[PDB]
Design a protein around this ligand. Structure first.
Ligand SMILES: *c1ncc(C#N)nc1C
Ligand SMILES: *c1ncc(C#N)nc1C
Ligand SMILES: *c1ncc(C#N)nc1C
Ligand SMILES: [Zn+2]
Ligand SMILES: [Zn+2]
Lengths: 198, 198
């Protein structure tokens, strides 16, 4: 039903790429990234830190956008949205529409887009230089449905596409990662990595 | 209701909170857990909170306190006193009976019912430390138990403390969880043991 945004990795002029913390797989972890799977595992509505790395500084007014798509070919034309249960939660922070799967945490300049032509959802923030004593910028994302939610993702894998954009929205860079939103991210990362090694 | 930001922000003046070291004896009425960033206190008892800055903010700076529910699914609900305690004859002459958080012993305290969000807050002028001291102390009271039915109803809350200029613009922000309970020392010990075992 909708055109599919590109997921092709594109570093661009500024050498744009993502990075992830090394959180491990203990029972207490709430967000953990698998480099072998290029896959983030996270709990519902919990902080997911994503690093933005560049080789050179983009202009003021550069923005960073996040959008989810279904990974599998037969589902990629379907808009990823919150399930019929969670979209009816009165849990908006006042910026995010209740249908949106991906939110930004702790940024009052976050903007949420419902695309008038494709109906896809995305959240965009200004790109900012690293804080004092840091080499990268970090964005905190929250995912507001479980991968297993019926009538929503319904156990289908998704990708998050992160795009670096100029102030008009033109593409400057692109990267992406798979996401599973689940109750036990550490256990599930261990299982999927063990499965991969066999 | 939209959700106030809880992001820690030291700002230009290096603003942050501090708490005295009270211990967990059975006789303690107010005790702070740094490991949990959580204050445990009895109903309507004095809670001293230290205000620290690295440099002096301008005259007319104010300090506001507001409570929100900690859990995502409840953050949009206004935190207020339960149907029982809002009808207690316990007015101090300044605080409206519906407000959970009071400032004790400050005749310049002002209480706000926000006309757009309906949230409650209490604000006082920010003052420099007394002679011989290095920080300023505010005394708060929490006027409902965490367990009160029809009020917090066993849901955790956060207190957000904001440093504001004379127009109400943000200069600094800090926050902490609160449990209002009959046995704060015992409950702090239990929750800290639970955290270690996790
Ligand atoms: C965005 N804007 C600026 C900078 C720098 N330096 N980095 C990003 C990711
Ligand atoms: C508020 N106003 C002034 C000062 C100083 N010095 N501190 C506060 C917390
Ligand atoms: C809870 N904690 C301490 C004490 C005392 N003394 N009593 C209770 C109920
Ligand atoms: Zn859902
Ligand atoms: Zn009550």
């Amino acid at each position: 039903s909708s055109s599919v945004p590109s997921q092709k990795t594109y570093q661009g002029s500024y050498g744009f790429r993502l990075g992830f913390l090394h959180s491990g797989t203990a029972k207490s972890v709430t967000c953990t990234y698998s480099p072998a799977l290029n896959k983030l595992f996270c709990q519902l509505a919990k902080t997911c830190p994503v690093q933005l790395w560049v080789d050179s500084t983009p202009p003021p007014g550069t923005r960073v956008r996040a959008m989810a798509i279904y990974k599998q070919s037969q589902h990629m034309t379907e808009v990823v949205r919150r399930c019929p249960h969670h979209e009816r939660c009165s849990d908006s922070d006042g910026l995010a529409p209740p249908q949106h799967l991906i939110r930004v945490e702790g940024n009052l300049r976050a903007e949420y887009l419902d695309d008038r032509n494709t109906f896809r959802h995305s959240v965009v923030v200004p790109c900012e230089p690293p804080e004092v004593g840091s080499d990268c910028t970090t964005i905190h994302y929250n995912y507001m449905c479980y991968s297993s939610c019926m009538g929503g993702m319904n156990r289908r894998p998704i990708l998050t596409i992160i795009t670096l954009e100029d102030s008009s929205g033109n593409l400057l860079g692109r990267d992406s990662f798979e996401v599973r939103v689940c109750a036990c991210p550490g256990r599930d990362r261990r299982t999927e990595e063990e499965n991969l090694r066999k």
